[PDB]
Paper text:
To improve the translational potential of our studies, we developed two [name] inhibitors, 1-(7-(4-(trifluoromethyl)phenoxy)-3,4-dihydroisoquinolin-2(1H)-yl)prop-2-en-1-one ([name]-9643) and 1-(7-(3-fluoro-4-(trifluoromethyl)phenoxy)-3,4-dihydroisoquinolin-2(1H)-yl)prop-2-en-1-one ([name]-9652). [name]-9643 and [name]-9652 inhibited [name] reporter activity with IC50 values of 5 nM and 15 nM, respectively. To further examine [name]-9643 and [name]-9652 binding to [name] proteins, we performed a protein thermal shift analysis and confirmed the binding of both compounds to depalmitoylated [name] and TEAD4 proteins. In contrast, when [name]-9643 and [name]-9652 were incubated with palmitoylated TEAD4, we did not detect binding in thermal shift assays. Our data suggest that the compound binding site is occupied when [name] proteins are palmitoylated. Co-crystal structure of [name] and [name]-9652 in 2.03 Å resolution revealed that the electrophilic acrylamide group of [name]-9652 reacts with Cys359 present in the entrance pocket of [name] to form a covalent bond. The natural ligand palmitic acid reacts with the same cysteine to form a thioester bond. The fluoro-trifluromethyl phenyl ether and aromatic section of the tetrahydroisoquinolin occupied the lipophilic pocket of [name] where the hydrocarbon part of the palmitoyl group binds. The fluoro-trifluoromethyl group occupied the palmitoyl binding pocket in two different conformations aligning the fluoro group deep inside the pocket or on the opposite side. Together, our data suggest that [name]-9643 and [name]-9652 target the palmitoylation pocket of [name] proteins and inhibit multiple [name] paralogs.
Author numbering:
A (entry chain DDD): 209 to 247, 252 to 300, 302 to 426
B (entry chain BBB): 209 to 248, 251 to 426
C (entry chain AAA): 209 to 244, 251 to 426
D (entry chain CCC): 208 to 246, 250 to 425
Write the structure that this text describes.
């Protein structure tokens, strides 16, 4: 009941704000987080429902899902924790991700930020395996957020009501595609949709399998 | 110059409070900090060790006995101005810790003795043994995230309960810590740091002043 | 399954030898390792009571207080295929990592036992760090005691593996992880040892400890 | 003693290495080259930059243009004696990497440009942007385990196939690396290292010699 195949598993996804107010003061706030698999079957969602929320030209979600394998494709619903004081104090907006496999491969992680189903920015990162605790580990550590995403978070936090933030987020999505660079095989695909958390616990997520009917 | 000989050099001393308010919220506050930095600077100022003998434990294993055995160039006075500007969230997922790092050209087994003293009498001692790790062309001795004893956690709580820094400084006049790093095999004193404390009133946060201890 | 409960789970256990031959050369050899399928096999705890101490705070007393689902037998096949070139820049160490949903002060007791009698105890207190959505307890590089370093040397001096296995019949390690505040047993690992003859190196088999 | 640094940025670590995992119980790490953290003392020995212009790319964005813009105190020649005494095992989960660390009193976005040059012509460029971490009372810029490009992995293999170090040294006469660390916001050159290579005369050691570049 996690984001993974037999070939690759998501261990960590963390989007955060670090703030160093002074030499004695450090703070780290998590906006969204997914942790490592821990021992019912995963709920399914028809991919046709999200076709308009992602690009559908050459290399689009429909084309990618068509090539398969279908068991690599997940819908991730995020509730973002925006309860943080953005000070004046060096700020760093970052994303940390970790994957694990039994196999050693060169993996390419494609991150596409999408507004009304149109690509606004793509970030491409290549990662090589590291043998830790009896498995091959792939870590993108402290990937800096683009100015688009920093500005977007600022604009959302300016809205006085969470229903207004959720309304804006209806047209905001992120597509994460992890590919074996050598074979061009899709290892993992995460279609990400966003709301703001109202919970005291903070950031939440719900994972679904993507299928056709 | 720095807290260091040809045999051992202090790289880092950091006393801190970590607080995890919730799964999305982490904070780390430094109370005191020393780092080693490449000098641009004069030799370290001297203090007569006779002036501080009453502020530390004496008789067998005491500062006078340790300084007598030498070497004298291993002995330093450290004046700390502690940053107490932090919100203790009722110790909700709180960790009080000390990180220290030393470096040497030699591979040694080092023993770090910490004696907390009230009016010149030992109130608690902590002893830690460290083994070298060869990192970046030097032997490194790292105590990572050593937990503070309950005496020190309670003491910090009591100080922060005082409404004025002048009241905290009055209490701290009679509070000292003696740090002794020893070669466990030869029993040679590598470094000795006699530590005295005030609270910082600076905007920048924690401050420190290092002196050599001499006899004259 | 794995070594864990709802309250605490073993993530990593490694016993190793590091050697720094020169400034450009570093080597690390693992003797034994555990990293986190049908349900785990059961073993009757009565079979192993004589292999561990049974006075006040002993295995029978600990198992009696429970919970029983915290108690495991770990059979290790140790990889002794390593050139102890010298103790020349050599470090013998143990790394362990545990995870829990709860924030606790955990006490890790390690008892080395010869013919069911304690020869050395190491007690290590660990405080949580919240990493990747869980509380993590890491003993990062715990130095081996001289007893264990000398024991490994003496075993490797024997010309045949059957002789090493014979000596190891009367050697055990008891690992007890306790909530320091409540004194609840979180995990107990009763460890028994053979030498590996496998090309793959170190192996292990985990069992639940039960009464019948 | 000798240190690659200015008042604005100082090299703490440069390490090029090979990690090998022979089996689940066996790990090895070999350093090819290493520069450590180092601190009155006299000036560094000088080299006329005109002598090395042919050994690095020139015209627009070139070493002459970079040195012209300055500051001159940011420019260093680094002679490396590489340790190639290592057993490259057959497909044994190998990782070829470079680890670098810089420190500053100032908080900056720094861009590290690495240009591998054969006969003074760029064969590969790697660009890495690093953001500061405030650690032990300073801003630290760490590129941890940057993977070596196939060109460099293949080059190390081909050199090690030669039966004599003097033959490797002959090949290395036309091999250089240019490291340029830039303040991304202001486009100021913080540090420039013009790197030349020999194989070490030692059985098991790596060495280096640092020089100032002058006109
Ligand atoms: C340039 C691309 C980039 O900076 N990204 C894309 C990857 C990524 C994924 C998740 C997050 O985290 C958030 C945080 C807050 C919200 C908000 F505003 F509440 F909806 C998010 F949608 C996503 C950042 C990035 C950064
Ligand atoms: C059991 C010993 C222990 O926990 N120690 C001794 C070593 C040590 C050194 C320094 C600090 O940091 C502080 C922080 C604040 C004050 C205060 F409050 F100003 F007095 C200090 F005196 C010392 C902690 C320890 C912890
Ligand atoms: C002082 C205690 C100590 O040093 N320990 C106890 C914990 C521990 C657990 C496992 C190992 O690893 C080995 C390695 C080899 C053998 C051998 F030789 F096969 F018997 C073992 F039994 C255990 C070391 C320690 C170290
Ligand atoms: C794609 C660029 C790359 O992978 N690089 C360039 C940066 C770098 C710097 C130094 C080293 O280390 C060596 C090791 C050995 C030799 C040799 F062959 F002996 F001369 C070197 F020249 C350089 C690697 C890189 C990797």
């Amino acid at each position: 009941r996690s984001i993974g195949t037999t070939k690759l598993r998501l261990v960590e996804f963390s989007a955060f704000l670090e703030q160093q107010r002074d030499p004695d003061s450090y703070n780290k706030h998590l906006f969204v987080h997914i942790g490592h698999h821990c021992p019912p079957p995963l709920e399914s969602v028809d991919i046709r429902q999200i076709y308009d929320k992602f690009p559908e030209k050459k290399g689009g979600l429909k084309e990618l899902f068509g090539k398969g394998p279908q068991n690599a494709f997940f819908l991730v619903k995020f509730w973002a924790d925006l309860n943080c004081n953005i000070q004046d104090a060096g700020a760093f907006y970052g994303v940390t991700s970790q994957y694990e496999s039994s196999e050693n491969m060169t993996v390419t992680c494609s991150t596409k930020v999408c507004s009304f189903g149109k690509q606004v920015v793509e970030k491409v990162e290549t990662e090589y395996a590291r043998f830790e605790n009896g498995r091959f580990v792939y870590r993108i550590n402290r990937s800096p957020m683009c100015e688009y995403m920093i500005n977007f978070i600022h604009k959302l936090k300016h809205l006085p009501e969470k229903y207004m933030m959720n309304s804006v987020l209806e047209n905001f999505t992120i597509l994460l595609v992890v590919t074996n660079r050598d074979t061009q095989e899709t290892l993992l695909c995460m279609a990400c949709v966003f709301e703001v958390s109202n919970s005291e616990h903070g950031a939440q997520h719900h994972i679904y399998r993507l299928v056709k009917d």
